[PDB]
Amino acid sequence: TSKQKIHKDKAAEPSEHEVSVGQAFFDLENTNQELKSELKDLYINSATQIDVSGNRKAVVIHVPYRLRKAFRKVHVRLVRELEKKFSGKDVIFIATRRIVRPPKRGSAAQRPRTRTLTSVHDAILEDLVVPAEIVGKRTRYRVDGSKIMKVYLDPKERNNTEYKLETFSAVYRKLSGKDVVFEYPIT
RNA sequence: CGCGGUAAUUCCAGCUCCAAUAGCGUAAUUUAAGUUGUUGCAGUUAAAAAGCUCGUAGUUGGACUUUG
Ligand SMILES: [K+]
Ligand SMILES: [Mg+2]
Ligand SMILES: [Mg+2]
Ligand SMILES: [Mg+2]
Ligand SMILES: [Mg+2]
Ligand SMILES: [Mg+2]
Ligand SMILES: [Mg+2]
Ligand SMILES: [Mg+2]
């Protein structure tokens, strides 16, 4: 039944790491009374490790879009329970989204704006900094040719994200390929 | 543009000198003309903003969708 917590696209076989994440997810469903009720409906569809720095790993778990709103209500508590099981790792939930390529020249086919690459990358960035809310964005175009984005986070949720700023920057570059640094505006 | 009204560098002549030269002078059009201006002109007082507003055609129209 631990494989009923994973629905990989195309009914593909979960890898050796997804089963560990799924198996760890099943345990919290029954062991933790607080999360008993909520975790029943929730399920994931992928999971991967990303190296951050200093032999540190980050568990990036993708979630069905329809369930992206249910995880938020139990995001703060669930991450605490999964991080202890996955010692020395940070858990990040990102809803799955499709990126439809722009139509060719003179094509009648339409494309919803949410399926655009820019709209998806911005949406991934918002799901990456949960529970922190973005309050500003800056993009600096360096003379050499590279560009770096600076994201301002609400200082209210600073205790739950101050230690993850390195994981956010590393996780976002692999999913988007863009440099990002997070900062808290003075208040 | 001006010269000539009794001491004319300007007219009529001689001399001398100058330019082009087997050629040179005189009587539509291009250049000069950014004096027709697309490149590229003007409109306070020199020529030139309609007394004022609406308004169709015309002309002109913010940003955003695949990057790395
Ligand atoms: K010119
Ligand atoms: Mg005489
Ligand atoms: Mg003369
Ligand atoms: Mg004229
Ligand atoms: Mg003029
Ligand atoms: Mg007058
Ligand atoms: Mg006048
Ligand atoms: Mg436009």
Q: Are A74 and A41 in contact (CB under 8 A)?
A: no
- Cα-based distances in Å from A70 to A73, A98, A160: 6, 20, 19
What's the number of CA atoms in the CB half-sphere (13 Å) around residue A123? 16
CA distance A96 to A62: 6
Phi and psi at A128, nearest 5°, equal -80, -30
Residue A173 beta carbon within 7 A of nucleic strand B:
no
Q: Which two tokens stand for residue A83?
A: 């991080």
DSSP per-residue letters across A33-68:
STTHHHHTT--BSEEEEEE-SSS-EEEEEEE-GGGH
Amino acid of residue A11: A
The string of DSSP codes covering A148-185 is EEEEEE-GGG-TTTGGGHHHHHHHHHHHH--EEEEE--
The answer to whether the beta carbons of residues A68 and A83 sit under 8 Å apart is no
Q: What is the CA radius of gyration of chain A?
A: 18
Count of positions (residues) in chain A: 187
- ∠ CA(A138), CA(A72), CA(A120), 5° rounding? 45
Distance A129 CA to ligand 4 centre (A): 74
Question: From which experimental method does this structure derive?
Answer: cryo-EM
CA of A147: nearest nucleotide by C1' is: B68
Asked if A39 and A28 count as a contact pair (C-beta separation under 8 A), the reply is yes
- Cα–Cα distance between A119 and A172 in angstroms, integer? 14
A119 CB closer than 7 A to any strand B atom: yes
Location of structure tokens 């920057």: A169
Structure tokens at A164: 């993850």
- Please enumerate in sequence order all residues whose Cβ is within 8 A of that of A112, keeping only pairs 6 or more positions apart, or say none: A100
Helix (H) or strand (E) holding A117: helix A117-128
Q: Residue A46 CA to B16 C1' — how many Å?
A: 115
Whole-number Å distance between alpha carbons of A114 and A120: 7
Q: Which helix (H) or strand (E) holds A120?
A: helix A117-128
d(Cα A184, Cα A159) in Å, to the nearest integer?
11
Name the nearest CA neighbour of A70 among A90, A40, A25, A99. A40
The reply to whether A118 has its C-beta less than 7 Å from any atom of strand B is yes
Whole-number Å distance, alpha carbon A118 to ligand 5 midpoint, is 55
Residue A12 has φ and ψ, to the nearest 5°, of -75, 160
Residue with tokens 């390195």: A166
Residue A113 C-alpha to ligand 2 middle, in angstroms?
102
Cα A86 to chain centroid, rounded: 16
Whether any strand B atom is under 7 angstroms from the Cβ of A100: the reply reads yes
CB A148 under 7 Å to nucleic chain B: no
Strand B positions with any atom < 7 Å from protein CB? 64-68
Question: How many domains, chain A?
Answer: 1
For A123, residues 6+ apart whose C-beta sits below 8 A from its C-beta are A95, A97, A114
Domain enclosing residue A29, as ranges? 1-187
Query: In whole angstroms, what is the distance from residue A94 CA to residue A59 CA?
Result: 11
